[PDB]
């Protein structure tokens, strides 16, 4: 079986490179962040523009939804994160503490904590309610490219241009595991699988890898795309067939069969690097976003 993603909508509005796209967990919305300092909200099924959320002083590298789709957190070059009430557009808290650009962010499943990664080489854990920095982890020796909580929020996985993937105990801040595969290319993205058993990691040597983190073993490799320069997001698509989805520096969206590792579809249309992709939580819909020469987001739909 192979999917049949087809272009449905193109979303224009950002004035600079788009950096990250994410669907709300309730499937109603798409949030996008950009180097233009703005967050934009769009309808997930029709691509209709909803509103702009402003307040950061410099460009934004990431945005993430809370579990209940009520809040967003954004990470900016202004060295802050901001927690937003999506329905009102209000900035509830500004998270100050990183000493350099904030690159990545996520809520935990309970949505009471935020994790962030920065050019200052640290991973920070923040209290959502008070906006206070609870813990600072001296995590890496180069910028932190991604941070993500596991299924119950007990662990954090982080990646960095230093070539490492690390697993941290949320409660103690202890480094439980360092994962690396015999070459040291920058690790440009990492996330836990929906079931929490695996970690999907991207490296700047044109490779995605699926790790069993309990065993510290690489189980699957996905190749064929171009990724040597940018921190491109990758996803598990689970609504229909089980795929791995990623953007690429050759301007395409790549889709692989998770089990066989074969490329099953390539989505053509963007005119610059596809930096971010997201998979809709219930429908076979992919959102893709591109860099400065393109500035658009595309919504693609498949029958499987």
């Amino acid at each position: 079986v192979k999917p049949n993603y087809a272009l449905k909508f193109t979303l224009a509005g950002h004035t600079k490179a788009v950096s990250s796209v994410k669907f709300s967990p309730n499937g109603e919305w798409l949030a996008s962040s950009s180097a233009d300092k703005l967050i934009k909200i769009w309808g997930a099924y029709d691509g209709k523009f909803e509103k702009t959320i402003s307040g950061h002083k410099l460009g934004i590298s990431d945005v993430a939804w809370s579990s209940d789709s009520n809040l967003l957190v954004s990470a900016s070059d202004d060295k802050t994160l901001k927690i937003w009430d999506v329905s009102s557009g209000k900035c509830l808290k500004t998270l100050k503490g990183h000493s350099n650009y904030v690159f990545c962010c996520n809520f935990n499943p309970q949505s009471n904590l935020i994790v962030s990664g920065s050019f200052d080489e640290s991973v920070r854990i923040w209290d959502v309610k008070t906006g206070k920095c609870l813990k600072t982890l001296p995590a890496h020796s180069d910028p932190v490219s991604a941070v993500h909580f596991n299924r119950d929020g007990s662990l954090i996985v982080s990646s960095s241009y230093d070539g490492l993937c690390r697993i941290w105990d949320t409660a103690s801040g202890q480094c439980l595991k360092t994962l690396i595969d015999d070459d040291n290319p920058p690790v440009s993205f990492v996330k836990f699988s929906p079931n929490g058993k695996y970690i999907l990691a991207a490296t700047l040597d044109n490779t995605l890898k699926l790790w069993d983190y309990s065993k510290g073993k690489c189980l699957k490799t996905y190749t064929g795309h171009k990724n040597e320069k940018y921190c491109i997001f990758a996803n598990f698509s689970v609504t229909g067939g089980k795929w791995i989805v990623s953007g690429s520096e050759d301007n395409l969206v790549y889709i692989w069969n998770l089990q066989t590792k074969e490329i099953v579809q390539k989505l053509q249309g963007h005119t610059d690097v596809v930096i971010s992709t997201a998979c809709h939580p219930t429908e076979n819909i992919i959102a893709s976003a591109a860099l400065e020469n393109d500035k658009t987001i595309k919504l693609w739909k498949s029958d499987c």
Binding site: K16, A17, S19, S20, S33, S34, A35, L58, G59, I60, S61, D62, S76, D77, Y101, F103, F119, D142, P143, Y161, P186, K229, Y230, C231, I275, L291, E292
Partner: peptide, 10 residues
């Protein structure tokens, strides 16, 4: 700008 939209060299 935004750091994700830039190249970072070790």
């Amino acid at each position: 700008g935004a750091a994700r939209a830039e190249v970072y060299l070790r």
